[PDB]
């Protein structure tokens, strides 16, 4: 008996769902010996981490198998998140947290006589991010899995900041010298991507010929939802040479993110992601369990364009439909616009992608044609509605026809998407009312806001188990999948007991992070000190230099009368500066030398410490963030759209000091201004000071203490061996400081003094903090996703624990 139900023996029936200790030790031993081809006598700590990661993967995959099985079966509309970069951090713990295996693994690994913490620290950060964008993608991928959406993450598959002589010194990030156990290569799903060549017009549709081919290799990484047994995918592509000296012009496409031919190489990078991706989707949807097959394309596919990097998806989808599936250009266009939605992240108007036609022309000729065609019909519709206005015309035109005419990628994205959104109320308003005024005026509804958010898993359960364990006891464990549940904590604004545990939790995380700075940067760390952190990328606009000014200023208050009640302060400033950014590299040395002084002079002792947090990255943010008291979100008004970091710090018991811009604004709304340290010029206050004109002249003198530091710095005080070294900051401070530092030097320096004041009264602090913590549930990246699903993708969230046994 028994036939080709013999093939039904090929199952995970008895190899999925058994998550006990015996089983975990047994898998661990299988991997360390069989997968790794090692033994207890030859295995380094790295060998053990791997064996443990593999042990965890198996469970992740088990659910990924059932998950994909559910999607094929239910045939849900699918979401595709298209981003150049994905800031993933480390995988292990996160996976153990989401699958609920932390505890068994803890014990499994104790029994084998290994320190799980040691293993967990061997993992390098997946170099797939460089900013807040790659990190927004990563929260979304988490929230989509958790929210039960059939999402996918499409991007590329590619940096160690080190300090030396107080200077930043870039160094290579070999994140894959030993491999990535988390990812799987699908060579069997490779795809050819084409560059260059030419287009041949025939009666049997247009053809692109004589092209240079680059292969696109998919690497899959499982993305686990939180405890619903749901597991999504992040497919990242690598480039390969098909079979003279160009057998690397492929590799280049994938070797560094944010790299003339350095502009070009970026273009090929963007197209490579876009072509491979679209082909992949089309392939997946042609295989769905489900005239014309594509008629339903937009009801089964939603593609999200994170910024203008993958703006080629529009003409590329059109190229596929018309030249390949061969449908009418007008049908393909309706399928297109309904597929795509565009997310604008840049406040800027002078920072949008714009490629020169002559370039798009050589590399992607069939695409330029398609683009010119989208345009004509585009303007053609405009001329209809507004006959005279020849200005609205050339304005709204996808192409900037001038010197060497350029294509406006941002415009292409808008015409080709059914929905455009911003990431904060005021930001989304500028995008609609100003930046793309013309566009909004036309199809007004097309525009909208989706306030950024942050994942409660990585940024609380994982990093701050102290805080989580605490909250849990008071308001149960529903805040995890519903962060607006944190409100219920206000019911403790009185519980003086509570605030005790609370600040205690902050001390513990604050104490641990201490053992770290000492063991790392080797400097006595004042565990009682008020940890004040500013960890944004190193740039002019982000200030930091303004904090430094406040770094030194506090350094004098302890020198001009060394016995006046001063609130102890450990100041942390971390971040990276582009290897080409001359200025910031200087602000980096500046902060270093300054630190040296304020640290070694024994007069200040355990009063104030300065620390440059080297190699700021996801995993580091995970160390600092929980142990921070004051969050430094102080960037000049009208420069920040959102501010993800702002939110991790408010979620974890830190308190915020900053301006009325970006995320601070919506934070004020939920907590209240009183519960936030606002200050400095409002966007309007600056909206005037420019007309008046600005010269650091005034502020310098009138502001005594300013003169101090201001000169201290220049007078070679912090730079003895080269006092004239920072003589480059002063010139672009007085003269060309496009960011008005001094102008706020007032509000700031004083502002802080109210902090030292609130800090001195513990009770005042903790009551305020709890007010910040119980108003952070709105900035959950789950709520941000719910929104996207309703008003954009038209897909519904699910709380269906996928079944392991079926």
């Amino acid at each position: 008996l028994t036939d080709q139900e013999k093939r039904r023996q090929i199952s995970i029936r008895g190899i999925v769902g058994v998550e006990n200790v015996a089983e975990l030790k047994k898998s661990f031993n299988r991997h360390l010996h069989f997968t790794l081809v090692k033994d207890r006598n030859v295995a380094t700590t790295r060998d053990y981490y791997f064996a443990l990661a593999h042990t965890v993967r198996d469970h992740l995959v088990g659910r990924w198998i059932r998950t994909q099985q559910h999607y094929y079966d239910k045939c849900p509309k699918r979401v595709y998140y298209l981003s150049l970069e994905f800031y993933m951090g480390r995988t292990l713990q996160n996976t153990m947290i989401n699958l609920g295996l932390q505890n068994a693994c803890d014990e499994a690994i104790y029994q084998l006589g290994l320190d799980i913490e040691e293993l967990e620290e061997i993992e390098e950060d997946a170099g797939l991010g460089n900013g807040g964008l790659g990190r927004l993608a990563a929260c979304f991928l988490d929230s989509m899995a958790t929210l039960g959406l059939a999402a996918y993450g499409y991007g590329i598959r590619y940096f160690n900041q080190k300090i030396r002589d107080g200077w930043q010194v870039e160094e290579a990030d070999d994140w894959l010298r030993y491999g990535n156990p988390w990812e799987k290569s699908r060579p069997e799903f490779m795809l050819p991507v084409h560059f260059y060549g030419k287009v041949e017009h025939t009666n049997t549709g247009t053809k692109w010929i004589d092209t240079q081919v680059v292969l696109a290799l998919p690497y899959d990484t499982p993305v686990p939802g939180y405890m619903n047994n749901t597991v999504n995918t992040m497919r990242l592509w690598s480039a390969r040479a098909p079979n003279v000296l160009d057998r690397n012009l492929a590799e280049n496409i994938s070797r560094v993110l944010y790299p003339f031919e350095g502009k070009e190489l970026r273009l090929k990078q963007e197209y490579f992601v876009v072509a491979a991706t679209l082909q992949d989707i089309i392939r997946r949807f042609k295989a769905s369990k489900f005239g014309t097959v594509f008629d339903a394309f937009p009801d089964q596919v939603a593609i999200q364009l994170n910024d203008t990097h993958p703006a080629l998806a529009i003409p590329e989808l059109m190229r596929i439909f018309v030249d390949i599936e061969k449908l009418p250009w007008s049908k393909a266009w309706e399928l297109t616009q309904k597929t795509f939605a565009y997310t604008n992240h840049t406040v800027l108007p002078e920072a949008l992608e714009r490629w020169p036609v002559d370039l798009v022309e050589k590399l992607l000729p069939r695409h330029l044609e398609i683009i010119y065609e989208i345009n004509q019909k585009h303007l053609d519709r405009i001329v209809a509605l507004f006959p005279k206005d020849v200005d609205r015309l050339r304005r709204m035109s996808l192409i900037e026809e001038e010197g060497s005419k350029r294509i406006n990628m941002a415009h292409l994205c808008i015409v080709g998407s059914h929905a455009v959104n911003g990431v904060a109320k005021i930001h989304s308003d500028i995008v609609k009312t100003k930046v793309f005024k013309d566009f909004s005026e036309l199809e007004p509804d097309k525009f909208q806001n989706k306030t950024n958010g942050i994942t409660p898993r990585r940024w609380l359960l994982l990093c701050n188990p102290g805080l989580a364990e605490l909250i849990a006891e008071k308001i149960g464990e529903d805040y995890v999948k519903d962060l607006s549940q944190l409100t219920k904590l206000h019911s403790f604004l009185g519980d003086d007991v509570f605030l005790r545990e609370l600040a205690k939790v902050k001390q513990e995380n604050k104490l641990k992070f201490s053992q770290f700075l000492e063991t790392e940067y080797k400097v006595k760390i004042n565990p009682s000190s008020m940890f004040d952190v500013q960890v944004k990328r190193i740039h002019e606009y982000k200030r930091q230099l303004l904090n430094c000014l406040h770094v030194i200023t506090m350094y004098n208050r302890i020198k001009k009368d060394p016995k006046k009640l001063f609130v102890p302060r450990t100041v942390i400033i971390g971040g990276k500066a582009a290897p080409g950014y001359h200025m910031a590299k200087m602000i980096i040395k500046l902060i270093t030398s300054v630190a040296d002084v304020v640290n070694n002079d024994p007069m200040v002792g355990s009063k104030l410490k300065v620390i440059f947090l080297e190699n700021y990255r996801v995993s580091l943010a995970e160390k600092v963030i929980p142990a921070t008291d004051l969050s430094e979100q102080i960037s000049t008004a009208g420069t920040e759209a959102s501010g993800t970091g702002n939110m991790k710090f408010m979620l974890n018991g830190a308190l915020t000091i900053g301006t009325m811009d970006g995320a601070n604004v919506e934070m004020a709304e939920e907590a209240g201004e009183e519960n936030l340290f606002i200050f400095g010029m409002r966007i309007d206050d600056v909206a005037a000071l420019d007309k008046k004109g600005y010269e650091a002249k005034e502020y310098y003198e009138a502001l005594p203490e300013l003169k101090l530091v201001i000169d201290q710095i220049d007078n070679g005080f912090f730079s003895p061996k080269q006092p004239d070294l920072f003589k480059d900051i002063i010139n672009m401070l007085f003269y060309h400081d496009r960011f008005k530092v001094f102008a706020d030097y007032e509000a700031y320096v004083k502002c802080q003094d109210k902090v030292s004041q609130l800090y001195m009264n513990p009770k005042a602090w903790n009551t305020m903090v709890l007010k910040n913590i119980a108003a952070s549930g709105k900035f959950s990246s789950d709520r941000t996703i719910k929104e996207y699903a309703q008003n954009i993708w038209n897909v519904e969230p699910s709380d269906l624990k996928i079944s392991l046994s079926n």
């Binding site: 094929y72 995918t233 997946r284 295989a287």
Partner: peptide, 4 residues
């Protein structure tokens, strides 16, 4: 055939 199914394409995951």
């Amino acid at each position: 055939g199914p394409y995951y």
